Amino acid sequence: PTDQSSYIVDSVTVKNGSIHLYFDKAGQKTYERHSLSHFVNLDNLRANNTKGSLPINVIVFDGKSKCEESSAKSASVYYSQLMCQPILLLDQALVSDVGDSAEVAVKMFDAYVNTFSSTFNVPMEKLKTLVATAEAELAKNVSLDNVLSTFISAARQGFVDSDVETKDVVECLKLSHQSDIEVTGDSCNNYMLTYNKVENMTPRDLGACIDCSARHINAQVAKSHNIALIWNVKDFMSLSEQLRKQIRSAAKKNNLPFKLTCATTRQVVNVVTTKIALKGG
């Protein structure tokens, strides 16, 4: 029994700004984890869409309507091929009482605080006051980016280097929570597996790579030396969504750690790595 194209979501559970979607795969109970943010507005997960792409491998439909379910199952034959993964078909009835903007934002913020605390080794007692202010402000409908930025600027003293910008920590936290990416304060390398070829990059992707001095590393040279791919958050974000996903999946294929950093310092080239250049020269 191979990985079909879609699976029906039977049940749902929420905890720490994340949702679990439960399905039966060849008689074994399984789940996929997604950030709660994709479930505030369900329209982005409907098969009709407005762009023709899904932010996650999930299709929301109305289980009360026969056509919506069958249409979504048909649509997931296309998206499964486009995304190179099966699609989870979720009835909108399972995600009725999930959250309410701020309600979900407070769950998000609490997850940001845990990643900030464990990344910069900051004791939770030192943040107690700044967390209380931040949570009472989110309930006042003060933007999450404002509350997060205000929190980081105040909480950063003595834990984050003066060289790193608050905005880069903010993006690291947000992204870390969206795609479950490890965050570090360590020097980046902007190393990329040889699998992601220059020939298949767009001018924006090749140029962005050359701009951040991205280097190519061979999968085996990286595996045997236990090399982690550490990208600067800004540099990584200058890349396309497709390229960002490809770099990460290639690292996961070879069991290589993938991390985002808020640091701008580069780690010393101690391994045989070739700088990404234009196909000609």
Residue numbers in the entry: 1665 to 1945
From the paper:
In an effort to understand the role of the nsp3 Y domains in the coronavirus replication cycle, we have determined the crystal structure of the 286-residue CoV-Y domain of the SARS-CoV-2 nsp3, the first complete CoV-Y domain structure for any known coronavirus. As a result, a shorter construct (residues 1660–1945) was designed and used for subsequent NMR and X-ray crystallography studies. The structure was determined and refined at a resolution of 2.4 Å by multiple-wavelength anomalous dispersion using data collected from a selenomethionine-substituted crystal. The completed electron density map allowed unambiguous tracing of most of the protein except the five N-terminal residues (residues 1660–1664). The CoV-Y domain of SARS-CoV-2 nsp3 has a twisted structure resembling a letter V with linear dimensions of approximately 60 Å × 50 Å × 32 Å. The 2.4 Å-resolution structure reveals that CoV-Y possesses a previously uncharacterized V-shaped fold consisting of three distinct subdomains named Y2, Y3 and Y4. The N-terminal Y2 subdomain (residues 1665–1763) is dominated by six β strands (S21–S26) arranged into two nearly orthogonal β sheets (S21↑S26↑S25↑ on one sheet and S22↑S23↓S24↑ on the other) to form a β sandwich-like structure packed across a hydrophobic core. The middle Y3 subdomain (residues 1764–1847) adopts a compact α helical fold composed of a three-helix bundle (H31–H33) packing against the 4th helix (H34) with an axial tilt of ~ 60°. The C-terminal Y4 subdomain (residues 1848–1945) consists of a α/β fold with two three-stranded β sheets (S41↑S45↑S44↑ and S42↓S43↓S46↑) in the center flanked by three α helices (H42–H44) and a 310 helix (H41). Y4 packs tightly against Y3 and the Y3–Y4 interface is dominated by hydrophobic interactions between H34 of Y3 and H44 and S45 of Y4.
The multi-domain nonstructural protein 3 (nsp3) is the largest protein encoded by the known coronavirus genome and serves as a central component of the viral replication and transcription machinery. Nsp3 can be divided into three parts, including a large N-terminal cytosolic region (~ 157 kDa in SARS-CoV-2 with ten distinct domains) followed by a transmembrane region (~ 20 kDa with three domains) and a C-terminal cytosolic region (~ 41 kDa with two domains). On the other hand, little is known about structures of the transmembrane and C-terminal regions of nsp3 or their exact function in the viral replication cycle. This part of nsp3 consists of two transmembrane domains (TM1 and TM2) separated by a luminal ectodomain (3Ecto) and two Y domains (referred to as Y1 and CoV-Y) in the C terminus. Previous studies demonstrated that the highly-conserved C-terminal region of nsp3 is essential for subcellular membrane rearrangement, yet the underlying mechanisms remain elusive.
